[PDB]
CSV table of N, CA, C and O and ligand atoms in Angstrom, one decimal:
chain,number,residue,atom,x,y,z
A,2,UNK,N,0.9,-1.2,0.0
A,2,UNK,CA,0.0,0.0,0.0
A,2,UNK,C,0.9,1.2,0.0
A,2,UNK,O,1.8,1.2,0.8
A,3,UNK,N,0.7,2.6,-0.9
A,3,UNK,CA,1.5,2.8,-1.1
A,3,UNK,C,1.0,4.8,-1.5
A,3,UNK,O,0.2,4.9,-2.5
A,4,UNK,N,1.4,6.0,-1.0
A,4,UNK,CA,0.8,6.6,-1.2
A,4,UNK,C,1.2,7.8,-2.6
A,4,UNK,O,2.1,7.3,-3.3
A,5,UNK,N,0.9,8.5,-2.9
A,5,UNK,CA,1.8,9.0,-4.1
A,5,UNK,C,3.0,9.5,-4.1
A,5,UNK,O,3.7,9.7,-5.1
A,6,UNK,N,3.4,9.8,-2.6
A,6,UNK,CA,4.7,10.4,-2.7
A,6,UNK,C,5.7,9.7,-2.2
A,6,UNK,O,6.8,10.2,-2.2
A,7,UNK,N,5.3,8.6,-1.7
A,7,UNK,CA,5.9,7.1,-1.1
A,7,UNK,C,6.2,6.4,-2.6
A,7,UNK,O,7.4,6.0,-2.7
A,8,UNK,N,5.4,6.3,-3.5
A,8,UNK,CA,5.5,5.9,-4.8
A,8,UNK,C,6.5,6.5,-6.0
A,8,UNK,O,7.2,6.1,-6.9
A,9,UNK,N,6.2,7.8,-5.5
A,9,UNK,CA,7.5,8.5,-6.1
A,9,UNK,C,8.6,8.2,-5.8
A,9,UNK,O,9.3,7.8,-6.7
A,10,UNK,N,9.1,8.2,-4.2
A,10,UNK,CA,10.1,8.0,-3.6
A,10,UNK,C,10.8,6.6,-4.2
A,10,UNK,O,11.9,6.4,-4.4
A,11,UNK,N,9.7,5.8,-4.2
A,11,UNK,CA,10.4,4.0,-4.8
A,11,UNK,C,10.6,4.1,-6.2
A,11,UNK,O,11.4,3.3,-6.5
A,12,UNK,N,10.1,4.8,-7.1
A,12,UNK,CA,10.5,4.8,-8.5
A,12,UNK,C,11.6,5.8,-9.0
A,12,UNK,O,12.4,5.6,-9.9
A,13,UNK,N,11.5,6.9,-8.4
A,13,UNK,CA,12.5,8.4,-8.6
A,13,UNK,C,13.3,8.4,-8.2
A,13,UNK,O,14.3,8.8,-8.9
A,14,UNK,N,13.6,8.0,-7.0
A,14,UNK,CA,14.6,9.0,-6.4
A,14,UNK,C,15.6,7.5,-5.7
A,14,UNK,O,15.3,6.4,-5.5
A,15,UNK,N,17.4,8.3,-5.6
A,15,UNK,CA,18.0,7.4,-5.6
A,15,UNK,C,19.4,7.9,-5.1
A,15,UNK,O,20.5,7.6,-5.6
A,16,UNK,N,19.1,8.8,-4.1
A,16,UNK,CA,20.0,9.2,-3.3
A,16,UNK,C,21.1,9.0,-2.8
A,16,UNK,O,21.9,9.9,-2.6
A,17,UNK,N,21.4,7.5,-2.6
A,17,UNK,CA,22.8,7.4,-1.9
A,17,UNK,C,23.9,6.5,-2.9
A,17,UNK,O,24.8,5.8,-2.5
A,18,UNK,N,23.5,7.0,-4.7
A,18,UNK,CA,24.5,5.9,-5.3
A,18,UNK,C,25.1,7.4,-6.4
A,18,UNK,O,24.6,8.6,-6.5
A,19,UNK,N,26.1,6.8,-6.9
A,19,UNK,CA,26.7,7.1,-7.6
A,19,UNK,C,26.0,8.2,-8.9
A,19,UNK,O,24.9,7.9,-9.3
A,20,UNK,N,26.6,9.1,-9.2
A,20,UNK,CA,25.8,9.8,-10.3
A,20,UNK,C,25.9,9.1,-12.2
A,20,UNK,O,25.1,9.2,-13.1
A,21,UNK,N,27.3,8.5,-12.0
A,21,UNK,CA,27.9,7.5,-13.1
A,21,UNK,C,27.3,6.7,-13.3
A,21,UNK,O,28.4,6.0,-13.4
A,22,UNK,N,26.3,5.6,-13.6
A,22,UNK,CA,25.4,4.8,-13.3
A,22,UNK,C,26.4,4.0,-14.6
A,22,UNK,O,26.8,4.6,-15.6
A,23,UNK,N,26.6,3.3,-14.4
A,23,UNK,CA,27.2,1.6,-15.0
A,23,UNK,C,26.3,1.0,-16.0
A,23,UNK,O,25.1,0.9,-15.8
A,24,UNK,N,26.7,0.5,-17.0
A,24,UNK,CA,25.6,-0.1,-18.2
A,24,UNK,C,24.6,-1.1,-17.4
A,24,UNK,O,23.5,-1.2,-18.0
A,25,UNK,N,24.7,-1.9,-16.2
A,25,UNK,CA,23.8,-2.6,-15.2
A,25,UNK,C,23.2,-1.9,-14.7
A,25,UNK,O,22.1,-2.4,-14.4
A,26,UNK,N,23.2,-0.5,-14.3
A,26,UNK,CA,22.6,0.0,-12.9
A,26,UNK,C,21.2,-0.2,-13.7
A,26,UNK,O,20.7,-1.1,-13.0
A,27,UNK,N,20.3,0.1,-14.5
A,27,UNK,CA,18.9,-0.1,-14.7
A,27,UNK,C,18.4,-1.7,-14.5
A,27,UNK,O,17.6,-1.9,-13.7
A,28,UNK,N,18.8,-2.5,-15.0
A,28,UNK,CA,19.0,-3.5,-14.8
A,28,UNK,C,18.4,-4.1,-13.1
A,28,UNK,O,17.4,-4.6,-12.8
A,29,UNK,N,19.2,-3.8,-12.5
A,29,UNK,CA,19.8,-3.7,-11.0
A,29,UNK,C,18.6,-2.9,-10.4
A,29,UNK,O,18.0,-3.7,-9.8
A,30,UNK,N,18.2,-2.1,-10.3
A,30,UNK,CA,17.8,-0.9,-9.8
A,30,UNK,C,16.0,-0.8,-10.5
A,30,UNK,O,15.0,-0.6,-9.7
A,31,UNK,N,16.0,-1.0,-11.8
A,31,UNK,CA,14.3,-1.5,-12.2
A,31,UNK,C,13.9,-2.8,-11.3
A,31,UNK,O,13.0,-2.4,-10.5
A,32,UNK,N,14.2,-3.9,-11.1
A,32,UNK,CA,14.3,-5.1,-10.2
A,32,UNK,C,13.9,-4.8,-8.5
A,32,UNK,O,13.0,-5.1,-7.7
A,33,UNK,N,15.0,-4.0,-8.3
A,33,UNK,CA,14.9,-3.7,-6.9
A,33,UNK,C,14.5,-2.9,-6.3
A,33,UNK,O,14.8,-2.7,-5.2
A,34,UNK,N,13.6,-2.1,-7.2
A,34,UNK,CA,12.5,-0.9,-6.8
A,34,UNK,C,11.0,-1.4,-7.5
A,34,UNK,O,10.1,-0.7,-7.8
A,35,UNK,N,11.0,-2.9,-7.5
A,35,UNK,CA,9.4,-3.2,-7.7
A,35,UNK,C,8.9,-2.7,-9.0
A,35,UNK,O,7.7,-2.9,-9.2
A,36,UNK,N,9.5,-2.2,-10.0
A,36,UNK,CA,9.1,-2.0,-11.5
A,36,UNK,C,9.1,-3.3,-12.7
A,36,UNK,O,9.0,-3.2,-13.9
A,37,UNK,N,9.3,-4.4,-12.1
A,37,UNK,CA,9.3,-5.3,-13.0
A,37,UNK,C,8.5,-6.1,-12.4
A,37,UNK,O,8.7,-7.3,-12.6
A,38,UNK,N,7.6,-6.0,-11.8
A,38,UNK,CA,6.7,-6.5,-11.3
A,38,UNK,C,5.3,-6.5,-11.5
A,38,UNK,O,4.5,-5.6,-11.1
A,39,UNK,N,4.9,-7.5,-12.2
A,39,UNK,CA,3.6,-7.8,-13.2
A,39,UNK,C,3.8,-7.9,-14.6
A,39,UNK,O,3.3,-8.8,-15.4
A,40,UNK,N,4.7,-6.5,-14.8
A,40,UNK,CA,5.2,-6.2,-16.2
A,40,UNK,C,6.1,-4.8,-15.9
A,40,UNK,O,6.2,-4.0,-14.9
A,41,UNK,N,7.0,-4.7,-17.5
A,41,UNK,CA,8.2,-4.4,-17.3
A,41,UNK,C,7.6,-3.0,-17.6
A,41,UNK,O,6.8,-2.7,-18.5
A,42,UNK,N,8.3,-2.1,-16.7
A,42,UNK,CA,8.0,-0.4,-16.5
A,42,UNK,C,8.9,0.1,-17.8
A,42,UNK,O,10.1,0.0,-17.7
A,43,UNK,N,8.4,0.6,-19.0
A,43,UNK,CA,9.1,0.5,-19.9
A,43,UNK,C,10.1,1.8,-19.9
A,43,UNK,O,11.1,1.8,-20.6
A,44,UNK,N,9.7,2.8,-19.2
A,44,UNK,CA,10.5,3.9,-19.0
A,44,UNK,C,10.7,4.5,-17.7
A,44,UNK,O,9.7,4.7,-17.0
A,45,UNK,N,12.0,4.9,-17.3
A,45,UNK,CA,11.7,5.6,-16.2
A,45,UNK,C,13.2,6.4,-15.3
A,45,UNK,O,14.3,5.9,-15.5
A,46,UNK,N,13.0,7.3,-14.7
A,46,UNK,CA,14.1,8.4,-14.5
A,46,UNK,C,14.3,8.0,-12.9
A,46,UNK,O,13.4,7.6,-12.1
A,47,UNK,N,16.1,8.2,-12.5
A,47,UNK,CA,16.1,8.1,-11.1
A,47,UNK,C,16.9,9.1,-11.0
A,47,UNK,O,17.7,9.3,-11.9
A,48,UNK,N,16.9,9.7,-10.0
A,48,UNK,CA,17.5,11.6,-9.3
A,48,UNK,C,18.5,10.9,-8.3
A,48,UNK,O,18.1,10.8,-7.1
A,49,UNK,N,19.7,10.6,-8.6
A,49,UNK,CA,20.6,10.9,-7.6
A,49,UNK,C,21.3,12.1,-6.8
A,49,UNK,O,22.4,12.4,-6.7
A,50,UNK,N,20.0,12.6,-6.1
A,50,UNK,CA,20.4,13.9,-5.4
A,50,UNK,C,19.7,13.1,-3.8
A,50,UNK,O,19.2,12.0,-3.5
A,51,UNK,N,19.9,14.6,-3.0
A,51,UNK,CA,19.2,14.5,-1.2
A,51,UNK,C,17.7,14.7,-1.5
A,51,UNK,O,17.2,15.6,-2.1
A,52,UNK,N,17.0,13.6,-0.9
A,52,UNK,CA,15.5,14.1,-1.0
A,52,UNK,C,15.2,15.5,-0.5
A,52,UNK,O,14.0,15.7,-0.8
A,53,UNK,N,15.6,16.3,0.1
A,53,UNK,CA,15.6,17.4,0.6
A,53,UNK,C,15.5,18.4,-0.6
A,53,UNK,O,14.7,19.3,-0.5
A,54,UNK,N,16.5,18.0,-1.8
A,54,UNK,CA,16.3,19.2,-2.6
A,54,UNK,C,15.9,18.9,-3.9
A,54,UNK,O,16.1,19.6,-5.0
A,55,UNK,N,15.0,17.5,-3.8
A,55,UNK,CA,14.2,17.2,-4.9
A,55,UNK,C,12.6,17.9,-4.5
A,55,UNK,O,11.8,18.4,-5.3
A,56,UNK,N,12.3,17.7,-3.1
A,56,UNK,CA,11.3,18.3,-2.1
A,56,UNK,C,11.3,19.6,-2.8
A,56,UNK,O,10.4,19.9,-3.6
A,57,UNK,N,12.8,20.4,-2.6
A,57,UNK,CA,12.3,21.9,-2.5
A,57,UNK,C,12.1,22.3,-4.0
A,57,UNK,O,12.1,23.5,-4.2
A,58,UNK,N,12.0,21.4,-5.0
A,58,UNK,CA,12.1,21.9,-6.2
A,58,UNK,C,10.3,21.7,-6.4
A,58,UNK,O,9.7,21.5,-7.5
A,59,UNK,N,9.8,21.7,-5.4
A,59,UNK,CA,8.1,22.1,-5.7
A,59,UNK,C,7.8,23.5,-4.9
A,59,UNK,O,6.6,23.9,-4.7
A,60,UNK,N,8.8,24.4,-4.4
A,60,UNK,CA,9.0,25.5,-4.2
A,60,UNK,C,10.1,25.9,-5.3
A,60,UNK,O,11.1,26.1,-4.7
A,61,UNK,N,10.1,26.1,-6.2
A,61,UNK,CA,11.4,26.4,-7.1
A,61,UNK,C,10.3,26.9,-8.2
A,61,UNK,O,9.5,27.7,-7.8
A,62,UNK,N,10.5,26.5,-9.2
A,62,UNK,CA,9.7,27.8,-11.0
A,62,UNK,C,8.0,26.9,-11.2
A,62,UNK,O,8.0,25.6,-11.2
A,63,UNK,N,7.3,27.3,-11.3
A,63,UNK,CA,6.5,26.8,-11.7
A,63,UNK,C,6.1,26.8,-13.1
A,63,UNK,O,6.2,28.0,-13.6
A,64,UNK,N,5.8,25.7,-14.0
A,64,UNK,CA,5.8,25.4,-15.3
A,64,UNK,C,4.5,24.4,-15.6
A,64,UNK,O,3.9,23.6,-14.8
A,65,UNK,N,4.2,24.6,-16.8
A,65,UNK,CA,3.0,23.8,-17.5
A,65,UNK,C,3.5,22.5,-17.4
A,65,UNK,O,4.8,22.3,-17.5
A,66,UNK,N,2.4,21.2,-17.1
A,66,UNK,CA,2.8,19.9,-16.8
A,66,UNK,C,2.5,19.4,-18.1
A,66,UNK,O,1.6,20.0,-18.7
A,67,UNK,N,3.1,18.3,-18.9
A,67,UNK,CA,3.4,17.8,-19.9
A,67,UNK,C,1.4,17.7,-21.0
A,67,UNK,O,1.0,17.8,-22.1
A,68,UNK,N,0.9,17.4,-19.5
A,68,UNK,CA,-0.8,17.3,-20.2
A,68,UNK,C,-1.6,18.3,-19.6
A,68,UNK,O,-2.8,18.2,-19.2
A,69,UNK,N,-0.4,19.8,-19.4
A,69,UNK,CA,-1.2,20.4,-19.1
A,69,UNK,C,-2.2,20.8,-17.9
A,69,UNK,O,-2.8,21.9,-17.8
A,70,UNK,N,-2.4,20.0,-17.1
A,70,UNK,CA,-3.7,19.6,-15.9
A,70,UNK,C,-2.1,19.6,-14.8
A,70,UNK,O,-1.0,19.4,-15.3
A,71,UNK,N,-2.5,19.9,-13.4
A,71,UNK,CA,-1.8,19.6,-12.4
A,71,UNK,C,-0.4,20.7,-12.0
A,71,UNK,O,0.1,21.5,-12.8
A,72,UNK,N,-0.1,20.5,-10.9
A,72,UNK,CA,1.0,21.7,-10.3
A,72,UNK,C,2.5,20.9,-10.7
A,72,UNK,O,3.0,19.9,-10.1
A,73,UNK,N,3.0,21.8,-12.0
A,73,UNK,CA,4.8,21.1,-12.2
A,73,UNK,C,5.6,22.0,-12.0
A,73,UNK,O,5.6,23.0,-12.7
A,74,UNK,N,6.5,21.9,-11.1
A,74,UNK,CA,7.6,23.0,-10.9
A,74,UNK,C,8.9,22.2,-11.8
A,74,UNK,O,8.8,21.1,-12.3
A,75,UNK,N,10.3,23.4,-11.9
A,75,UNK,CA,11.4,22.8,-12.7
A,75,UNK,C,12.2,23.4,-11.6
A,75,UNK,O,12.0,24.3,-10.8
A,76,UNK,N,13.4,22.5,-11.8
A,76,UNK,CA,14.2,22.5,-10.5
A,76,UNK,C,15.5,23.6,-11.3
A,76,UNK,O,16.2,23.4,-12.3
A,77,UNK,N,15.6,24.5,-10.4
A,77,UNK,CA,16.7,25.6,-10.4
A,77,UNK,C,17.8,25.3,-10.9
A,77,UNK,O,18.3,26.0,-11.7
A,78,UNK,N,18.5,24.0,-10.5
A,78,UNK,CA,19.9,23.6,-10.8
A,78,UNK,C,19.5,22.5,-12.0
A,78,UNK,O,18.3,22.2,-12.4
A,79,UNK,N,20.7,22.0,-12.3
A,79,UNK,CA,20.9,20.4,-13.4
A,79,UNK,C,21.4,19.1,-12.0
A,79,UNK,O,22.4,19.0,-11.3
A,80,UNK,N,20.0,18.4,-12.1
A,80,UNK,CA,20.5,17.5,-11.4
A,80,UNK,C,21.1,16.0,-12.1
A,80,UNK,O,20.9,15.8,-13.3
A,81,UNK,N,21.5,15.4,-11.3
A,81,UNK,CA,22.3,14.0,-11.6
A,81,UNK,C,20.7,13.4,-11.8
A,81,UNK,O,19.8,13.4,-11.1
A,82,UNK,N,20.9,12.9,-13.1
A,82,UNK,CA,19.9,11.7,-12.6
A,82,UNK,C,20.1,10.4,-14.1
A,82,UNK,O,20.8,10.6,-15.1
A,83,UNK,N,19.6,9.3,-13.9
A,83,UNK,CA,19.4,8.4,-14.6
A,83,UNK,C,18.1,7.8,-15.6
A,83,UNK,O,17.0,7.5,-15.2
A,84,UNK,N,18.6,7.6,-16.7
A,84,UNK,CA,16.8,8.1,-17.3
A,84,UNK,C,17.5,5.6,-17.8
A,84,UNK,O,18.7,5.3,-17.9
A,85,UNK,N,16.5,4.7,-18.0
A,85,UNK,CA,16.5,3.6,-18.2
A,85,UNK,C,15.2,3.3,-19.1
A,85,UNK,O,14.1,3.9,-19.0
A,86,UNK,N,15.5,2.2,-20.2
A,86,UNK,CA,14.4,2.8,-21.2
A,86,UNK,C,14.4,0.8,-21.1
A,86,UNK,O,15.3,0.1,-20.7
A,87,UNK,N,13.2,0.5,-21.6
A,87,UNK,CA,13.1,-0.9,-21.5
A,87,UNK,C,13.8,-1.4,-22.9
A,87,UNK,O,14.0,-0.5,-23.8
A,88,UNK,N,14.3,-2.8,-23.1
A,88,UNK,CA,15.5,-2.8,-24.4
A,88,UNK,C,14.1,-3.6,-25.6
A,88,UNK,O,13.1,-4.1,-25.3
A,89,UNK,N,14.5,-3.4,-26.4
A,89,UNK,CA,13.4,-3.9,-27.5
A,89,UNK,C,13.0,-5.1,-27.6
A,89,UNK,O,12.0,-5.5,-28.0
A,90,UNK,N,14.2,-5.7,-27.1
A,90,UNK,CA,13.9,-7.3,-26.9
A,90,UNK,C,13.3,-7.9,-26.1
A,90,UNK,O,12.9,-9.1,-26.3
A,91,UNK,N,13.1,-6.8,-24.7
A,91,UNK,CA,12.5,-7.3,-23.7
A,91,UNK,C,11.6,-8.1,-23.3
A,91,UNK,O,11.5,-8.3,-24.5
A,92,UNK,N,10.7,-9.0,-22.7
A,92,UNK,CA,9.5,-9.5,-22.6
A,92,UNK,C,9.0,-10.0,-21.3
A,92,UNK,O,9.2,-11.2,-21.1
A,93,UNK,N,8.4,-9.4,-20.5
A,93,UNK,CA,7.6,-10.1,-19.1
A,93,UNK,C,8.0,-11.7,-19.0
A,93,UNK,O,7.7,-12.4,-19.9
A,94,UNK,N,8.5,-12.2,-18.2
A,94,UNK,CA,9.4,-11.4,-16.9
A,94,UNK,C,10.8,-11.3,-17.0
A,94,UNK,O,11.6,-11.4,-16.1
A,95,UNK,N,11.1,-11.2,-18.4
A,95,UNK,CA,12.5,-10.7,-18.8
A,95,UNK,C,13.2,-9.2,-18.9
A,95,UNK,O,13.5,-8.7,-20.0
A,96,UNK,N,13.4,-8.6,-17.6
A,96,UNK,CA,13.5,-7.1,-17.8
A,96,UNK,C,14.7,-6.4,-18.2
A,96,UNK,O,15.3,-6.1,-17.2
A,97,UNK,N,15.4,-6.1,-19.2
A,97,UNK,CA,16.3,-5.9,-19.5
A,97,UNK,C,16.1,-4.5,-19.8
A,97,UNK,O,15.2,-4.2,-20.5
A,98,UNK,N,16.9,-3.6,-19.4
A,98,UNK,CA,17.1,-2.0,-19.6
A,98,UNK,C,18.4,-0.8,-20.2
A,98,UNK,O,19.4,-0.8,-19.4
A,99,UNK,N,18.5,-0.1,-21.0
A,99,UNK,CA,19.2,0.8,-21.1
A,99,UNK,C,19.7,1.9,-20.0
A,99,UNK,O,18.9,2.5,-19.2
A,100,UNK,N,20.7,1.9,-20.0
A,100,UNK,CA,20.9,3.1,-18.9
A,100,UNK,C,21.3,4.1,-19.5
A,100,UNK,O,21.9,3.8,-20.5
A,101,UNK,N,21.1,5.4,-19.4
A,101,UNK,CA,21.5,6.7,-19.6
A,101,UNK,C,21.9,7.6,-18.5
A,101,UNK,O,20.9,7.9,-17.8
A,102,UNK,N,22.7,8.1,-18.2
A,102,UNK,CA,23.2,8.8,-17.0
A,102,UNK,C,23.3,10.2,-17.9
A,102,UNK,O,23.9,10.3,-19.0
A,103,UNK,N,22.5,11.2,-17.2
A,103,UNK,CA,22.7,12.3,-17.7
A,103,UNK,C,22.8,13.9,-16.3
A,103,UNK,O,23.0,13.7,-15.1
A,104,UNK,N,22.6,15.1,-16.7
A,104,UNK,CA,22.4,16.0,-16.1
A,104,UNK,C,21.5,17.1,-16.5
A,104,UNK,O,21.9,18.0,-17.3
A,105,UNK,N,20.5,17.1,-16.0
A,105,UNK,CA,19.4,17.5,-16.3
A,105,UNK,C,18.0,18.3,-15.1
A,105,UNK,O,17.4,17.9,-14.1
A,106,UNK,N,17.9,19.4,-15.6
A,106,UNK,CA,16.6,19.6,-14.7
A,106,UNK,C,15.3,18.8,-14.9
A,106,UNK,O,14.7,18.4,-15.8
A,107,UNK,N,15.1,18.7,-13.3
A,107,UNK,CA,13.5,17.8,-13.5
A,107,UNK,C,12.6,18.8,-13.0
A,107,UNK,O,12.6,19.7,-12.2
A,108,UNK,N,11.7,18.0,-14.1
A,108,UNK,CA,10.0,18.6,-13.5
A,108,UNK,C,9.0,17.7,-13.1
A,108,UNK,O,8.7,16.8,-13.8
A,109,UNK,N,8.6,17.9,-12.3
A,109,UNK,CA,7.8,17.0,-11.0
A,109,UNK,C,6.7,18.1,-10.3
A,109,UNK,O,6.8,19.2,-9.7
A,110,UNK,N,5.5,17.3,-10.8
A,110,UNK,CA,4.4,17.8,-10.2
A,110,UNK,C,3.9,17.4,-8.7
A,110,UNK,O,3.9,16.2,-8.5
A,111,UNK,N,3.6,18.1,-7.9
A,111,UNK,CA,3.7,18.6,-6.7
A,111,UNK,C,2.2,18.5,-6.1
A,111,UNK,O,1.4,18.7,-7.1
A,112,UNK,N,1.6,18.3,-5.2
A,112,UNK,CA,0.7,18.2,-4.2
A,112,UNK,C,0.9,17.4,-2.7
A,112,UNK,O,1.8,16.6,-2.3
A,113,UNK,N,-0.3,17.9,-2.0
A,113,UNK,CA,-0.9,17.4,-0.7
A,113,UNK,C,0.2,18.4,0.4
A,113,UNK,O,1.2,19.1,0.3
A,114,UNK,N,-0.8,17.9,1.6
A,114,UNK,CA,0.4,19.2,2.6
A,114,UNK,C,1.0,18.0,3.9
A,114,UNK,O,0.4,17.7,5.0
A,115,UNK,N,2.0,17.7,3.5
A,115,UNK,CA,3.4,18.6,3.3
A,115,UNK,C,3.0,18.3,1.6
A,115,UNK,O,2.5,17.3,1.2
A,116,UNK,N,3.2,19.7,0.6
A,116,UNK,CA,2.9,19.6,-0.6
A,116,UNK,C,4.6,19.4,-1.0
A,116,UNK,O,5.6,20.1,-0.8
A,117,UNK,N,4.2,17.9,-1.8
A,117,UNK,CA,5.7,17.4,-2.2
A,117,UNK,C,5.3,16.5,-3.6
A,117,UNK,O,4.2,16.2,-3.9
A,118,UNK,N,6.5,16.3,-4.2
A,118,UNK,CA,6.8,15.6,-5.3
A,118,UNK,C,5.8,13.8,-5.7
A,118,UNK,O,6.1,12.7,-5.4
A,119,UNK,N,4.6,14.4,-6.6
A,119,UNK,CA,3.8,13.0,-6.8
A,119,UNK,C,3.8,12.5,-7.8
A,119,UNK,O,3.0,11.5,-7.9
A,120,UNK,N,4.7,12.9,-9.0
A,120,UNK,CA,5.0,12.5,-10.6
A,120,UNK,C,5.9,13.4,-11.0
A,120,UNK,O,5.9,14.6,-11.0
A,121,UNK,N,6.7,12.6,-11.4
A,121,UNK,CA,7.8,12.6,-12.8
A,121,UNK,C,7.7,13.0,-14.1
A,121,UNK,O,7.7,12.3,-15.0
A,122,UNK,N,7.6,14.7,-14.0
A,122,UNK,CA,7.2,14.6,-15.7
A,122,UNK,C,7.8,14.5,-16.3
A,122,UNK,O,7.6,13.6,-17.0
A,123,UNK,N,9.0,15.3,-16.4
A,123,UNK,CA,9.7,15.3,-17.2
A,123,UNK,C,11.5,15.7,-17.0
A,123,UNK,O,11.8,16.2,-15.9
A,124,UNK,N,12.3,15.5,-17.9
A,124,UNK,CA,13.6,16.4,-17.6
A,124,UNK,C,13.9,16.9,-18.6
A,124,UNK,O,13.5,16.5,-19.7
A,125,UNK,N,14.9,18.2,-18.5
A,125,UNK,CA,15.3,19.1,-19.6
A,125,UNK,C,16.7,19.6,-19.3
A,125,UNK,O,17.1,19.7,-18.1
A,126,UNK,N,17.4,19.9,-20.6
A,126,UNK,CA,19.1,20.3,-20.4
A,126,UNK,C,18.8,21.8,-19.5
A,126,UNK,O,19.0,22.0,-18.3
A,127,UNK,N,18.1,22.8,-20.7
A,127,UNK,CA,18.1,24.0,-20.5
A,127,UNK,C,17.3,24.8,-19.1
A,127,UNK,O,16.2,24.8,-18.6
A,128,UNK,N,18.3,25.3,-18.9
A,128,UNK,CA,17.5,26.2,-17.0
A,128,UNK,C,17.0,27.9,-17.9
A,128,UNK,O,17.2,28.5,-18.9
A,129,UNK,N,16.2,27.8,-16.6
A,129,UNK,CA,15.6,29.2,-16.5
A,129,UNK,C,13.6,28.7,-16.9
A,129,UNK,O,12.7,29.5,-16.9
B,1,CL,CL1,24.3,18.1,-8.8
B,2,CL,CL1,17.6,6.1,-26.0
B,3,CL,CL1,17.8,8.2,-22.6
B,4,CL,CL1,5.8,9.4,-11.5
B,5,CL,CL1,16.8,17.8,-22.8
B,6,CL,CL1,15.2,16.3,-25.6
């Protein structure tokens, strides 16, 4: 049972590893955050920063959310993060993944009080 920002927390965020992510780390890391479970999560981003300053980036710019509907802020700095794309070959319960380690601002739509981080929209190179 799992609430939205508890759910964020198990698919996003990935605080205490490396920003270099290794041709395994999606691999490794889709597995052991419960995304390959049922079926293979075919995309998805991890923020190696302090939950602290992925939090405050729902006080940081506020920006239109990818569909438009909902509260998305974009985070001030370029953070570390890891984007993992499912491989073509793939097939339930065979999860095999791309890693991409990049640096990038994210945008993450925001609610409830404490009003914090409840989806992953999106990331981008360019600030401001
Ligand atoms: Cl950083
Ligand atoms: Cl790609
Ligand atoms: Cl990518
Ligand atoms: Cl999300
Ligand atoms: Cl980009
Ligand atoms: Cl792009």
């Amino acid at each position: 049972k799992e609430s939205r920002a508890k759910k964020f927390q198990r698919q996003h965020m990935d605080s205490d590893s490396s920003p270099s992510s290794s041709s395994t780390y999606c691999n490794l890391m889709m597995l052991l955050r419960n995304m390959t479970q049922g079926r293979c999560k075919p995309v998805n981003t991890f923020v190696h920063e302090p939950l602290v300053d992925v939090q405050n980036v729902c006080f940081q710019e506020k920006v239109t959310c990818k569909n438009g509907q909902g509260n998305c802020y974009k985070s001030n700095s370029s953070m570390h993060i890891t984007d993992c794309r499912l491989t073509n070959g793939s097939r339930y319960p065979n999860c095999a993944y791309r890693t991409s380690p990049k640096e990038r601002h994210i945008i993450v739509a925001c609610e409830g009080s404490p009003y914090v981080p409840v989806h992953f929209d999106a990331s981008v190179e360019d600030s401001t």
